[PDB]
């Protein structure tokens, strides 16, 4: 939300 | 009291301002070993989506394990210019892999912050990440 990093973890990058 | 065995990887990419790749397009790390499992990183320096084209993103994928699936904690952070792990993320709790699959974090830093030479995050141009992988053995 212009956060320096966001905690979300989340798979299938590709 | 589970049993977790912890391993620490680290990668450098060079000339980190030159990159050219854009949303979506990756930058894979070599594979490396922890036990007969094998995992490799996977950056998107521009992100995957419009969402986080302001934010590079990182992920943890597992190219081997010897039996069907792997539960293991990750933790996230890069190498600052005066020598210190900056920036950690870790996954609170284990994800399940099998091979081909990634976890990590769309969001993990946002560009401008990363190119913001005040944070010392590309000294010489060149961004150092560091994985641990805790992986929970059988
Ligand atoms: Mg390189
Ligand atoms: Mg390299
Ligand atoms: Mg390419
Ligand atoms: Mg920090
Ligand atoms: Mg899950």
């Given at each position: 939300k212009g956060?320096?990093?966001?905690?979300e973890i989340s798979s299938n990058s590709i | 009291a589970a049993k977790v065995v912890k391993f620490s990887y680290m990668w450098t990419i060079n000339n980190f301002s030159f990159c050219r790749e854009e949303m979506g397009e990756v930058?894979?790390?070599?594979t490396f070993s922890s036990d007969k499992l094998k995992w490799c990183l996977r950056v998107n320096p521009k992100?995957?989506?419009?969402?986080?084209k302001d934010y590079l993103?990182?992920?943890?994928?597992?190219?081997?394990?010897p039996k069907s699936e792997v539960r293991a904690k990750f933790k996230f952070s890069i190498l600052n210019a005066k020598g210190e792990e900056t920036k950690a993320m870790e996954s609170q709790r284990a994800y399940r892999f099998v091979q081909g699959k990634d976890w990590g974090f769309?969001?993990?830093?946002?560009?401008?912050?990363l190119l913001d030479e005040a944070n010392g995050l590309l000294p010489d141009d060149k961004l150092t990440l560091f994985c641990e992988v805790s992986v929970v053995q059988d």
């Open positions: 956060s320096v990093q966001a905690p | 930058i894979k790390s070599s992100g995957l989506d419009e969402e986080s993103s990182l992920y943890l994928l597992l190219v081997s394990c769309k969001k993990f830093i946002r560009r401008d912050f």
